């Protein structure tokens, strides 16, 4: 007994209803008719939709373990092969992200902490930025280098320059992949998999830039292999390894070099264009609010001044700019669709009943936009996240990073790199148009997996 839904035609099922363009809205204008959760087929695939708080909180949440499991596909494991973290499932998903966890707490890997090495990448993005000399640019690829950088400090221990031709290239490769992979298209060929046979050169590039990427992370964990020091790990890759040799004995584990080269491509992959994203839409947001980026300025001032360099503890202190920090990830609305889900037995939902490994998809955007919780939710408000005396107000709405087990594995960096870089340049820099800024448009252009703000340039002037 699966939930209501449109009627489904026999071999394509729902698809021709809904935009593959932006699937979200198709979704809420479902919502509107069959109510918080339905059925839709893609294909011959049935997938149950979580729409609005309640929906998503009880699934996520109250039902937790049953909805941990991830919604696969055949792309993903061409790509994975079920290795890693964002792709696998069962007692190898839940050993590796338990580790995967640990070692990513702020000290969770040696004497440097994650906020240190963040730190020091902040510090480098506004240097790039000074060199701009204030004159107007595309910030994309600058505010790209940035959080790919900060992952590979983050398991290969050092930084890249950024004109570095390995980093350069390491980049360009993981940039082809997201385009091609947050494409309507891929949608299609998921559900229908002959399909893919009509794309062979993207096919081809996809699986190539694949295969290089692991051979780079495999060249780079045999250097760390042959001047590993246990008392003191140097990143995720030592830490890994040091796990596999206490796991030696054992032959049915899960550490071994084939997932860890998966786990190190999927937190390039999940926290690369992710926080990318988020920083371009942010900038773009406080380029279009002058009096919204003036405030954080001032608590910047305020709270952290002119010869230091802000931290992770001085957020405490700025309930202003945490508001703002939560407002544009909120309003930016990363993944309005969430990452799908499987239900990991026959689960029991109300008054229905989900098979054993059918699709989920919780909407996080109808959490991230409801209209109680958020007044006027289509309107970027740091007042959304403060309260009558100006300090900050948490949401239990505030779901971008997903919610229950499965939530983001790297939250507390994402969060930490986007309170770092956006105060660390806001403290160097003013935000100037080349425009007008009533020209500068906001509403996302793209919604296909991620959603994209507009292209814009802007000017960072030197305070
Ligand atoms: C502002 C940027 C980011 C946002 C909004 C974000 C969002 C999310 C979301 C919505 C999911 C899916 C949760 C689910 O399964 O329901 C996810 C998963 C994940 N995130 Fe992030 N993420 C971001 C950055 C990061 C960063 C910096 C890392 C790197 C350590 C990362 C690592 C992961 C991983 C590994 C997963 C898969 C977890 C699993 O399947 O168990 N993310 N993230
Ligand atoms: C940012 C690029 O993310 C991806 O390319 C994803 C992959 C490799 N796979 C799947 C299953 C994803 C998806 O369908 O998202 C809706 C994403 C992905 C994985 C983990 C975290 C995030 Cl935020 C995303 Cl978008
Ligand atoms: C080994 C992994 C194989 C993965 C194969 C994935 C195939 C995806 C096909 C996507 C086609 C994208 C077309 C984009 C068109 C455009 O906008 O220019």
Known sequence: ??????????????????????????????????????????????????????????????????????????????????????????????????????????????????????????????????????????????????????????????????????????????????????????????????????????????????????????????EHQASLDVNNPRDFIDCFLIKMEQEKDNQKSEFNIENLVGTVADLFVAGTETTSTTLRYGLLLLLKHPEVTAKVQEEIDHVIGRHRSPCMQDRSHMPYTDAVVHEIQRYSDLVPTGVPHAVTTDTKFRNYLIPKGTTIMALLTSVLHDDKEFPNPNIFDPGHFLDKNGNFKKSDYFMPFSAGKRICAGEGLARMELFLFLTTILQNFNLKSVDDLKNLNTTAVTKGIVSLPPSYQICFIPV
């Open 1 to 222: 007994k699966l939930p209501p839904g449109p009627t489904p035609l026999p071999i394509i099922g729902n698809m021709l209803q809904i935009d593959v363009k932006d699937i979200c809205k198709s979704f809420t204008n479902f919502s509107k008719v069959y109510g918080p959760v339905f059925t839709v087929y893609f294909g011959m695939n049935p997938i149950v939709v979580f729409h609005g708080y309640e929906a998503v909180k009880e699934a996520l949440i109250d039902n937790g373990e049953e909805f941990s499991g991830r919604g696969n596909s055949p792309i993903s494991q061409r790509i994975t092969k079920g290795l890693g973290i964002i792709s696998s499932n069962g007692k190898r998903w839940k050993e590796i992200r338990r580790f995967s966890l640990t070692t990513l707490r702020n000290f969770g890997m040696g004497k440097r902490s994650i906020e240190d090495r963040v730190q020091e990448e902040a510090h480098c993005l506004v240097e790039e930025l000074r060199k701009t000399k204030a004159s107007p640019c595309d910030p994309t690829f600058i505010l790209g280098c940035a959080p790919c950088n900060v992952i590979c400090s983050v398991v290969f221990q050092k930084r890249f320059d950024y004109k570095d031709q390995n980093f350069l290239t390491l980049m360009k490769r993981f940039n082809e992949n997201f385009r091609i992979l947050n494409s309507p298209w891929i949608q299609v060929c998921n559900n229908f998999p002959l399909l893919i046979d009509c794309f062979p050169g993207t096919h081809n590039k996809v699986l190539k830039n694949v295969a290089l990427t692991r051979s780079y992370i495999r060249e780079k964990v045999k």
